[PDB]
């Protein structure tokens, strides 16, 4: 159906001739404008910040490629030469490394803004699903980026995460030496991981095309979770404003704040997030004492090592398959599938309340999943002793159940709150 705005009539003589041959004037006009709902709060900034961080990565990503040498004997030294001798090359390295945290911090806030306010749920399904493959890609990309300076964190994560595919039965050992380029994690691995850490962020920019495409086509969502009067044209005017110059400027501002933040982090604590054993040149004989995965992989880290073969549900399934889904492969399936039940989120909300602050039962399970997440990332830093094996098993199971049990329940077992009917009405409940 689609929010009726006054589109592009090629007015002056310039634009009249342009439009007969390449209509870009109007495509930028009809996307920089757009009837964008006016009640949008600061949890909506985190998509411009994301898109900025991707441009920032793509940009500093190439600088670094003019300097970094992808081969084992040269690799850690080249990165090390970039710190010392390349003019401003420390501030490139630090910015491209800490970037990936920002790129990942905010994709989480992006995902929990979307999780509250029904932004997975119709019309918004394709908006969501395309974000999934952008997520997968962003993770795999940030993996391959960390392999590059061949430090001990680099090396062993590559032995681990390639080895994850070896957990697949039958065909899985082959898939291993395919990503490996043979027996071990030698050099053929670091040459191929230079290549795909370059290619994949371009595929990622091509999918934010199809992401910006999709959220325009659904029409932009609002925090009432009500749609944006697609009946007359002047009631849409009370419902929406144009992006430019209202929501362009808001998304600019918070970015200038997010960047004010991010620049102080690079300037005054740039190895906080980085786990110092990457400055320990990669030894294929010693896996370090304190091998922690990088922070933004930590809560899914924990889902893999919740499920040892003491965990009854594993023993069961190792039981039922009689040998195949042991706690290696089980915890793989557990972790890969911990994501897959978050992809599945529009089909497993059953409630036809879209949004959030007019849903008070759902609203408290959610702040348990925010907590869950924070506890899951936390317990990845923690050893596999008591209580931590239990804690992780609680976190992992809460998670897994929120998308499976709690969500296609709560539709049935809960009535709403005072939900409005106009985007203006909520906005005026303020004027």
């Amino acid at each position: 159906s689609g929010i009726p705005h006054d589109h592009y009539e090629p007015k002056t003589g310039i634009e009249k001739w342009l439009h007969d041959r390449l209509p870009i004037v109007g495509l930028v006009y009809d996307t920089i404008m757009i009837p964008t709902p006016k009640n949008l709060n600061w949890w909506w900034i985190w998509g411009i910040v994301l898109a900025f961080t991707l441009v920032l990565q793509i940009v500093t990503g190439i600088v670094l490629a003019m300097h970094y040498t992808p081969h084992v004997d040269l690799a850690f030294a080249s990165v090390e030469h970039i710190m010392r001798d390349v003019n401003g090359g420390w501030a490139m390295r630090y910015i491209h490394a800490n970037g990936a945290s920002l790129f990942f911090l905010a994709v989480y806030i992006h995902i929990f803004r979307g999780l509250y306010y029904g932004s997975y749920k119709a019309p918004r399904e394709i908006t969501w699903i395309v974000g999934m493959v952008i997520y997968l890609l962003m993770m795999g990309t940030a993996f391959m980026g960390y392999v590059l300076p061949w430090g001990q964190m680099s090396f062993w994560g590559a032995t681990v995460i390639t080895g994850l595919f070896g957990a697949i039965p039958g065909i899985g050992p082959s898939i291993q030496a395919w990503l490996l380029g043979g027996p071990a994690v030698d050099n053929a691995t670091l040459n191929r991981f230079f290549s795909l850490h370059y290619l994949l962020p371009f595929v990622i920019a091509a999918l934010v095309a199809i992401h910006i495409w999709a959220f325009h086509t659904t029409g932009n969502n609002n925090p009432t979770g009500v749609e944006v009067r697609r009946t007359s044209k002047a009631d849409a005017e009370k419902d929406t404003l144009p992006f430019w110059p209202y929501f362009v400027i808001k998304d600019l501002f918070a970015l200038a704040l997010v960047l004010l933040g991010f620049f102080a982090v690079v300037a005054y604590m740039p190895n906080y997030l980085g786990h110092p054993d990457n400055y320990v040149q990669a030894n294929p004989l010693s896996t370090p004492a304190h091998i922690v995965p990088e922070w933004y992989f930590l809560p899914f880290y924990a889902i893999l090592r919740a499920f040892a073969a003491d965990v009854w549900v594993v023993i069961l399934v190792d039981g039922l398959t009689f040998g195949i889904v042991d706690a290696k492969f089980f915890g793989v399936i557990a972790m890969f599938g911990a994501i897959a039940v978050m992809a599945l989120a529009p089909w497993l909300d059953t409630s036809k309340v879209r949004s959030g602050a007019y849903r008070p039962k759902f609203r408290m399970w959610f702040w348990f999943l925010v907590l869950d997440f924070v506890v899951l990332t936390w317990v990845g830093a923690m050893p596999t002793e008591y209580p931590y094996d239990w804690i992780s098993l609680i976190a992992s199971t809460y998670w897994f159940a929120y998308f499976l049990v709690i969500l296609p329940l709560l539709g049935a077992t809960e009535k709403p709150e005072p939900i409005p009917a106009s985007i203006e009405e909520d906005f005026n409940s303020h004027y």
Partner: protein
């Protein structure tokens, strides 16, 4: 007595980098390499800052190199690296060690309440040199080699003074490195009492500079991103105050 860089807008101590330079050359260079440090950088801004033609003379004295073209030797130049001292009896290349070491466990082991403080690295170096002790718990005539250090967590613990249960029931563990500063081992220029603590306070700050030689630059950079993105931010706030107030 608390380092000079460390803080919110502190710099490298001009004096102390020079002071600590001499300690590497006289004591540590026989067993430790800097294969990722180009020697020319001694004369660089924001470091120890030496004379260029001294640096050349100094570099001459460091040992030969099978030079990559001729395939034969020469006296080492200032464009070249410090030598790879990793042979036998030799320790790790400390080329970028003072950010490769951070034995900092807590609070709740994830990196949490370090809120007046820092990250930890130059101060593991200080504690590595000072903490060479008498073997406390048990153990007879040494372990021959393996010297007890009270800080070095990760090395040799004998099972006689590990446990019956499992773990080490001692704090530090046994190194492989001889107690390298028997006190007053060299002589200073800016007065400065050459103590075992004062030499180990000093060679710590130098080995930080062989990790972040561009450090006093990021302190300078920070102030300018603070102005620039600060009053782009402040200015963008004023552009939302007096533009949104039509609908506010």
């Amino acid at each position: 007595h608390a380092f000079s860089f460390e803080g919110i807008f502190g710099k490298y101590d001009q004096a102390q980098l020079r002071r600590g330079f001499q300690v590497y050359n006289e004591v540590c260079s026989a067993c430790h390499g800097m294969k990722f440090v180009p020697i020319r950088t001694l004369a660089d801004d924001g470091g120890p800052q030496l004379d260029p033609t001294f640096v050349r003379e100094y570099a001459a004295g460091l040992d030969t190199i099978i030079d990559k073209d001729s395939g034969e030797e020469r006296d080492r130049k200032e464009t070249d690296m410090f030598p790879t001292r990793v042979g036998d009896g030799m320790g790790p290349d400390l080329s970028v060690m003072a950010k490769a070491r951070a034995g900092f466990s807590g609070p709740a082991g994830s990196g949490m309440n370090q809120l007046f403080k820092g990250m930890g690295g130059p101060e593991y170096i200080y504690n590595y040199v000072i903490g060479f002790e008498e073997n406390p718990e048990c153990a007879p005539e040494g372990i021959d080699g393996y010297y007890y250090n009270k800080t070095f967590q990760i090395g040799g613990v004998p099972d006689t003074c590990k446990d019956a249960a499992g773990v080490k029931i001692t704090h530090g563990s046994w190194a492989r490195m001889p107690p390298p500063l028997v006190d007053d081992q060299v002589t200073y220029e800016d007065g400065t009492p050459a103590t075992v603590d004062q030499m180990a306070q000093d060679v710590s700050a130098f080995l930080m500079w062989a990790a972040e030689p561009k450090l006093v630059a990021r302190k300078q950079m920070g102030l300018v991103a603070m102005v620039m993105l600060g009053l782009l931010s402040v200015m963008l706030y004023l552009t939302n105050k007096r533009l949104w107030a039509p609908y506010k």
